[PDB]
Write a structure and sequence with these properties.
Chain C: This is IP17216p. This is part of a larger assembly, with chains A (50 residues), B (123 residues) and C (60 residues). Chain A contains 1 helix and no strands. Chain A has 50 residues and is largely without helices or strands. Chain A is elongated. In chain B, α2 packs antiparallel against α3. The chains are: A little secondary structure (50), B mainly alpha (123), C alpha+beta (60). The structure holds 7 RNA strands.
RNA sequence: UUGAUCAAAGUAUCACGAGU
RNA sequence: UGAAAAUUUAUGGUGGGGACACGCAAACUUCUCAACAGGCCGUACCAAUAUCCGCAGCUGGUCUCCAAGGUGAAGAGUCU
RNA sequence: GGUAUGCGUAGAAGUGUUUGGCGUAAGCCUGCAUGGAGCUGCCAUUGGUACAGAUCUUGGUGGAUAGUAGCAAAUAAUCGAAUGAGAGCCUUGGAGGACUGAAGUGGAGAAGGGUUUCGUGUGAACAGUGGUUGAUCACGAGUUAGUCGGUCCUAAGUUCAAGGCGAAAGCGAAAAUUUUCAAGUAAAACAUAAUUUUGAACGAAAGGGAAUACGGUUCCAAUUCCGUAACCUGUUGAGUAUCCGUUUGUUAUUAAAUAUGGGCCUCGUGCUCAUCCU
RNA sequence: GGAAGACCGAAACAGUUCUGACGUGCAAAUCGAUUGUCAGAAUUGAGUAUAGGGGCGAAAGACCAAUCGAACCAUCUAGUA
RNA sequence: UUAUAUACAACCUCAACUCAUAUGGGACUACCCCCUGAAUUUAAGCAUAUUAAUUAGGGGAGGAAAAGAAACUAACAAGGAUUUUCUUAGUAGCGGCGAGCGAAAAGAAAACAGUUCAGCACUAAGUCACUUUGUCUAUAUGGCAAAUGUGAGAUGCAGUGUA
RNA sequence: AACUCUAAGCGGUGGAUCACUCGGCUCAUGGGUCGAUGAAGAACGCAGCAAACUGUGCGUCAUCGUGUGAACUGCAGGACACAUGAACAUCGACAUUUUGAACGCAUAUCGCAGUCCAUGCUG
RNA sequence: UGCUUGGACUACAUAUGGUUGAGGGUUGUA
């Protein structure tokens, strides 16, 4: 940490803003197939590296 | 507040248009306050409609900013790059079709005097 | 405080706030909150009151 | 005999002048 | 036989530019002193017997920084 | 593909079965009970055609045990108060016992982590025991600089202009040969003059290196924020040796004048001599 | 008077004998007793070279990402018996 | 204009340009094109054969690509551009004459389209392209002349003429 | 009654059977469409409550004209600006951040430039 | 003048002109 760079500050928001759960109403679409997420990150059961 | 029909906006002027432009974006930023402060309606949801209303203005502003160019860039060669008929690749840079049918002299004398005659060789 | 687009070169805020509100800047400060947003810091002048600024604008 | 030297002087005839 | 180079001083140097004495001065002046801006991004926390890598909160390998009272050779080892 | 005026929500396929039966046997026919939309018999053809097996592939699930194996290293926890549906803990806060011993289980830095840091709220998996707090979720905030630092310089070395070679890609390469392959330099006609060899660039938050620190401050941030106190770099501006002998001030001695003299001359007024610090 | 690849020793490292402690661990190599150097052939964080029949090796065929008498990953590969 | 003592005009090789004005590396790949060329396998083993003028092979194209108008056939009562299919034929020879390889004109079917270059004699550069200025319009890197404004062009442009 | 043996009922772990399939692969006729005007792939930024897949490019879940002719919808809220078009699809208009074949020198650095006008303050 | 804020620009290989050309290359006029 603490000496990142301006990709790995902007890359790390996208692997941060994707760490919500499901939108908390959108399981009332038509044909709701979304229970909880596929990409769902913890941070010791899942690594980043890309 | 009415939907700005772009058919209506084709009669206006650019000085009125920029006057029409900033009259909406200045009010727009005040609407974003209610998004973050949680304003008085459930939502001041006009920032969908006024957004596309704002985007209706730029293009017709660009249109006469475009349409005035190509009439005064008539009657030249060495044309503007961004105004040069963006069609394809494999027929721009290979031998233009008014210029690739330029038949040769010893091939337009054998197409002069013995022509194709439309008969039916039959008994 | 301000939240801005991602090319705020610290003088565009010095350009814009006096263009939008006639507010003298004092010291324009910038940090990037790592969720992808550039939170801004600007300091008023003495004659401008901060509670008078947003109450003019509408921010409580 | 652990200094040091660049960047024309000299000369010649013309410019042999301009301003005056 | 114990790195390079960015940046830097002073000196040397032929030219050249200052350069009147009844003064008006001037001085990238290496002096005193006043206005004037200085963009870009990185900053929270763990920093390892619970945030690292060890398929895991696993006695395992992890770069250095500060470093006290006593006894005593002492950064020992025992003790607050 | 032909076929049976084929049965089918008035229950069609498989699933069970202590209903009943036919074959030598593989296999059907049949009753009931689920079940909810399609199915079989004769005769022509035919395809990836019937499984106990392959240290067979995949997905449940046993006995041992579904409570045995063992969760034993780092001295060692404890009563009372809370609160809690419920506490050996952790969750606290009250005591007060012992450890870590300053080449710590302590305070902050690197690589790597990437939202863990913080408040607020909590039910279940998560914490190889519990759970009222957690490095889990829910939900909110949170990282401010001219001086800290990347940024410039260059190190071993990437071989990274087209001289070259290779069928092309590209070359486990001190590319030192490549009209001028000069950076140029206030410059002068009449290749501006002797001059410059590799032209380019990356490469160190550990080496080189513009310049600062002090006190307090928040729910978490500080050589950054305010309070106050300096500096650097660049730009601009103002003052800043520098007015003489003499005589304007002043009788002169003196004084603005950084230190005036000189011969001459009627003294010199005239003349001459000149300051790029003492 | 303080020189030497000099000695006994500590964090730095190494890994000897016990063939001791678990050998469905604490672990796809570690813990606990013991032992050696310890001011240089020393110990090491970063940068950079070296390439699959070769790199590198104070030389064991060690080491090259838990693989090393030739890796490691897709194919000609349902390769042959 | 060359004791290496000056100009000017050409020429000739030859530069430099934030000149003008414009063309190209790249993506994909089944098919296609010129390339480089391996191996298990088969021979009961293997070394020439085979896998094969083959998978990476990568440079190139397109709606076609390459070929194509014979320096061919055949040897006959002749035929006649190139490509794909049926057959020639699993026959001719190549073969450790081992395993295994392997065509072909000729016969019939689709479609059919033949011709510019070079070079005598072809006999007033009669050529071509920019430029600018207008004609004419058009999303033309455009049609008509001109100044005959350049330059290209005799080291050869054009017309007619070609196995 | 414990327990163990055995049938069925019944509850329970399980997902096999049969059915159903907004999909797969095969078969064959059609057409020429690949960039220096910025392609192909990525990074991000996206919207009211939004992570994705899909859509886009500061005009950011869509976009001018066009066509057809009233809605998308879990909900709030705007529309009925149908009647001078909802919402679709078509699509010619305009747009096209960021990077490539990097067309500035150049990337483990959003860093270093250089030319010229425009536009603000020095002044 | 310098600051900050916009734009346009500023690859290399390369073809045909354009400009300025360099040459004890080759002559010619002197």
């Amino acid at each position: 940490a603490a000496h990142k760079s301006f990709r790995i500050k902007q890359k790390l928001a996208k692997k941060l803003k994707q760490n919500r759960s499901v939108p908390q109403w959108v399981r009332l679409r038509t044909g709701n197939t979304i229970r909880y997420n596929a990409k769902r990150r913890h941070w010791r059961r899942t690594k980043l590296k890309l | 507040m009415v939907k700005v029909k772009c058919s209506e906006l084709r009669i206006k002027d650019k000085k009125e248009l920029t006057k029409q432009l900033d009259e909406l974006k200045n009010e727009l930023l005040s609407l974003r306050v209610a998004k973050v402060t949680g304003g008085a309606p459930s939502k001041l949801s006009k920032i969908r409609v006024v957004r596309k209303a704002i985007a209706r203005v730029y293009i017709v502003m660009h249109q006469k900013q475009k349409e005035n160019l190509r009439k005064v860039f008539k009657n030249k060669k060495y044309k503007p790059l961004d105004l040069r008929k963006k069609k394809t690749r494999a027929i721009r840079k290979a031998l233009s079709p008014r210029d690739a049918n330029r038949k040769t002299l010893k091939e337009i004398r054998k197409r002069s005097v013995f022509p194709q005659r439309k008969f039916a060789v039959k008994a | 405080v301000f939240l801005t687009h991602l090319r705020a070169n610290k003088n565009h805020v010095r350009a814009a706030v006096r263009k939008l509100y006639d507010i003298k800047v004092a010291k324009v400060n910038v940090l990037i909150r790592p969720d992808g947003q550039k939170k801004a810091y600007v300091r008023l002048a003495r004659d401008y009151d901060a509670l008078d600024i947003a109450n003019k604008i509408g921010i409580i």
